[PDB]
Amino acid sequence: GTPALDTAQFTDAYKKANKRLLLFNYDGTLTPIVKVPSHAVPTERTRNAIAALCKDPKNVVYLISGRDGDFLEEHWGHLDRLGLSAEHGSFVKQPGEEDFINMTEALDMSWMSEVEEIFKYYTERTTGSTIEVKKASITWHYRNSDPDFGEFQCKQALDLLESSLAPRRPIEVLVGKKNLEVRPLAVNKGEIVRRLMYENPDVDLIFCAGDDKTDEDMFRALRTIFPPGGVVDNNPVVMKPPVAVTSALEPEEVAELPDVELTIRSKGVFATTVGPPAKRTLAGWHVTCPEEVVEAFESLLEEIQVV
Numbered sequence: 647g648t649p650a651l652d653t654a655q656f657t658d659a660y661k662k663a664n665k666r667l668l669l670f671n672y673d674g675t676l677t678p679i680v681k682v683p684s685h686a687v688p689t690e691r692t693r694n695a696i697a698a699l700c701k702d703p704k705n706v707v708y709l710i711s712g713r714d715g716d717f718l719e720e721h722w723g724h725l726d727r728l729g730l731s732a733e734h735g736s737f738v739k740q741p742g743e744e745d746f747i748n749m750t751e752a753l754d755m756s757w758m759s760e761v762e763e764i765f766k767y768y769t770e771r772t773t774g775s776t777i778e779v780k781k782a783s784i785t786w787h788y789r790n791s792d793p794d795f796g797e798f799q800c801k802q803a804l805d806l807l808e809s810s811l812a813p814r815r816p817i818e819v820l821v822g823k824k825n826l827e828v829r830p831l832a833v834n835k836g837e838i839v840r841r842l843m844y845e846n847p848d849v850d851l852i853f854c855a856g857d858d859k860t861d862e863d864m865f866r867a868l869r870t871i872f873p874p875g876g877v878v879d880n881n882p883v884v885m886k887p888p889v890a891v892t893s894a895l896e897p898e899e900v901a902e903l904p905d906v907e908l909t910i911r912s913k914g915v916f917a918t919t920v921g922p923p924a925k926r927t928l929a930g931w932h933v934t935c936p937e938e939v940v941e942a943f944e945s946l947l948e949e950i951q952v953v
């Protein structure tokens with residue numbers, strides 16, 4: 647379990663920080679889980695909060711989501727300083743650019759047809775189920791199927807994917823909130839976080855929030871930068887160039903990339919899961935609802951206006 651996010655302690659750290667890495671999951675984190683995937687549109691207050699955070703040059707703000715780049719662009723593309731990571735770190739659109747860096751170019755993607763065929767099979771035989779073919783991942787939804795037959799069908803599809811496909815393909819099979827998803831094995835939200843840390847060695851405050859099991863990759867990455875027993879004394883925390891950085895480059899470029907000394911210390915990392923106190927997680931904190939994640943920064947933002 648975890649203590650509830652100490653917004654007081656976080657507020658003061660936020661004010662003292664020179665460079666802040668702010669990482670937000672989307673679904674279930676910045677916006678509630680709802681019936682229909684395309685209906686998960688950010689509220690006015692939510693859009694305003696993230697905007698203000700991007701307005702600050704001290705902040706480096708990213709969304710890290712399993713969503714497709716199109717959906718993310720549609721609702722967030724209007725914020726010039728907001729970075730976007732789509733489909734579990736298979737794509738990355740920095741605040742500067744306008745196009746997504748394909749993190750999967752060097753990966754074997756021949757598995758997509760096989761997975762699509764399987765999900766089509768179950769979509770046709772599971773009323774209310776839907777399929778979401780994305781650019782580097784595929785999601786099968788059953789949230790609007792019959793409660794019982796949906797889970798049953800889910801277990802059968804899962805068993806088929808795990809028994810006959812996973813063991814021979816570079817994929818990971820994700821059990822999401824009333825969905826199944828298949829992604830490339832070599833990418834995850836954790837690698838994106840590490841890429842971002844490598845890019846910004848001057849970060850002295852990290853916030854990261856997520857509601858799903860896939861977000862635990864982020865929480866783990868935010869821990870394993872430090873030695874298993876915590877940093878000892880005033881030792882330098884050094885970080886090698888991560889896979890999410892090197893795989894995009896050419897071997898000549900990669901050979902030139904140096905190790906970096908990170909400014910961040912564990913006390914500066916606020917890893918927050920969305921869920922109940924009892925939820926077992928690698929995050930250091932929790933908040934019960936996505937709405938409280940937003941309100942935390944709304945209250946914080948208002949306080950910044952004063953002084």
Ligand SMILES: O=P(O)(O)OC[C@H]1O[C@H](O[C@H]2O[C@H](CO)[C@@H](O)[C@H](O)[C@H]2O)[C@H](O)[C@@H](O)[C@@H]1O
Binds near residue numbers: 684686822824
């Ligand atoms: O990584 P995030 O930003 O959380 O999204 C990953 C996952 O999320 C979406 O599905 C979920 O949210 C919708 C909207 O509330 C629900 O209807 C689904 O039941 C949830 O599973 C995306 O649509 C998926 O493609 C993606 O895998």
Ligand SMILES: [Mg+2]
Binds near residue numbers: 671672856857
């Ligand atoms: Mg989520």
